[PDB]
Amino acid sequence: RHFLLMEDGEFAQSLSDMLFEKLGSGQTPSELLNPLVLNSILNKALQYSLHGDSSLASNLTFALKYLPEVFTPTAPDALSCLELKYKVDWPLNIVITDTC
């Protein structure tokens, strides 16, 4: 609820700062370092709001998908092409499936 439904809005307010790092698409790099520094800054954004331990922070992962925004080449968005991925772990698998 705190990181998908956004009812502790400090993470989604920090998403607005991640929305303040795109500013239109596409003008962003297409290197493989483009997921490398962008998967980090969302993990760094949770400590920027001072909430939660690292026990649930392993359940959040970010997968930067690839979609064209200049529409002939790729330069993927973070307004609608940045996605949080919740994890499936060892005891909790009857709660989370692939459809959800």
Partner: protein, 436 residues
């Protein structure tokens, strides 16, 4: 992140901010000299938004307090809540001021202590690399809070241009004019700076205080010790989306952005119902949210002296209804269902209106997690009745030859009196023009 620096200033602005910081420790579960309860982090999910961030789990207040009168600060250090304040951020021991009672005193004292007034208050600015803004917790009554407060509304407009300015300013009392007589002069000089040199204000009338102070509070002799009780709760009530974890309009630039129609129209009407302690014995039976906002639009909790028969040709444009603590949110859309059927708010015929409702969980405390609380931030166009009251008391005083020879000896060479009169009528004409 979202750090706000409060600018407590004047004889009345320092006392209303003294219990504002004293209110914050009782709800954060902290002591002003220590941390004895563990309720500060499990119950409250955010604390470093008005306090300075911790060095030893000691949340320093981000506050500055300047006044010409040393009497307001000598009633502070003997109280046990002054050790939370620092004796190096603002002043050390034995701080003084002027003599002193004049609007031209603090207006002329701003440029002679210009080096020191822009030195120690800027040390708290670069503590966070993303500053929210400045709130001037000052006064309009007297010449102390009105004289020096008009200077900082000008020089902080260009030195810090990308910061939010919005003040919780208290209006003076207009019952008799014997002890003070300079009240129409120093008020309108600051009121010009509150519209063009300031974005938003939060009005707090004095004649409407004793309307509430004898309503349910049952006092016989009105003292100044009751003026801090109505004011300090609604200050902490206004930051419940900002201090406690909320989602939408959880910043101070979130709330004020959704209510201001235009510049020089920013005077927000405030309302707050629950102030009685014997209501507590009957809130155990699930007192709902369906009855608490029917009385907000009803003119009973208002803190603005306005006309009762002038609401038919005036129209609400923006109305805020903040519920706190236990809300029972399965019926909060049910409370907003009943708004359109009564039409207690007159709507503007040129554009849409908005009734915004929001919620946030309160402090883990027994008088807070049991009783429903409703904070109102209205915006109605009948606020020109106060501006008609102040202007009619302004031009009547200039025909009686009052304070025209006693006021222009120091630092006033030209007549700037009609410079305040036309700009006040510009506000009063654009309000009635705003509903076409």
């Amino acid at each position: 992140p979202r750090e706000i620096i409060t600018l407590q200033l004047g004889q009345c602005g320092n006392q209303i901010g003294f219990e504002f910081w004293k209110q914050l420790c009782a709800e954060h579960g902290i002591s002003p000299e220590g941390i004895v309860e563990e309720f500060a982090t499990e119950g409250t999910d955010r604390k470093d938004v008005f306090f300075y961030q911790a060095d030893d789990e000691h949340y320093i207040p981000r506050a500055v307090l300047l006044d010409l009168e040393p009497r307001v600060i000598h009633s502070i250090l003997n109280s046990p809540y002054a050790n939370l304040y620092n004796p190096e951020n603002i002043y050390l021991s034995e701080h003084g001021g002027g003599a002193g009672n004049n609007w031209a005193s603090g207006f002329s004292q701003g440029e002679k202590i210009h080096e020191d007034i822009f030195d120690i208050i800027d040390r708290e600015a670069d503590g966070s690399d993303s500053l929210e803004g400045f709130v001037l917790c000052h006064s309009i009554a007297g010449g102390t809070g009105s004289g020096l407060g008009s200077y900082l509304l000008e020089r902080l407009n260009d030195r810090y241009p990308k910061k939010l300015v919005q003040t919780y300013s208290v209006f003076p009392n207009q019952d008799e004019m014997s002890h003070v007589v300079v009240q129409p002069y120093n008020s309108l000089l600051t009121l010009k700076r509150l519209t063009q040199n300031a974005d938003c204000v939060v009005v707090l009338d004095n004649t409407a205080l004793n309307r509430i102070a004898t309503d349910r509070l049952h006092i016989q002799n009105p003292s100044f010790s009751q003026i801090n009780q109505l004011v300090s709760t609604i200050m902490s009530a206004s930051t419940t989306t900002l201090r406690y974890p909320g989602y939408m309009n959880n910043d101070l630039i979130g709330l004020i952005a959704s209510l201001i129609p235009t510049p020089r129209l920013h005077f927000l009407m405030t309302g707050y119902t629950p102030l009685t302690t014997d209501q507590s014995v009957a809130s155990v039976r699930k007192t709902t949210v369906l009855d608490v906002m029917r009385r907000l639009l009803q003119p009973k909790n208002v803190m603005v002296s306005t006309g009762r028969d002038r609401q038919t040709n005036h129209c609400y444009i923006a109305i805020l209804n903040i519920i706190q603590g236990e809300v029972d949110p399965t019926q909060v859309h049910k409370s907003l269902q009943r708004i359109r059927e009564r039409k207690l708010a007159n709507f503007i015929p040129w554009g849409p209106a908005s009734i915004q409702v929001a919620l946030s969980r309160k402090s883990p405390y027994l008088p807070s997690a049991h009783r429903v609380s409703g904070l109102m931030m209205a915006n109605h166009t009948n606020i020109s009745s106060l501006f008609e009251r102040t202007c009619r008391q302004y031009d009547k005083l200039r025909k009686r030859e009052a304070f025209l020879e006693q006021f222009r000896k120091e630092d006033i060479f030209k007549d700037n009196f009609d410079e305040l009169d036309n700009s006040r009528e510009i506000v009063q004409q654009l309000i009635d023009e705003y509903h076409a």
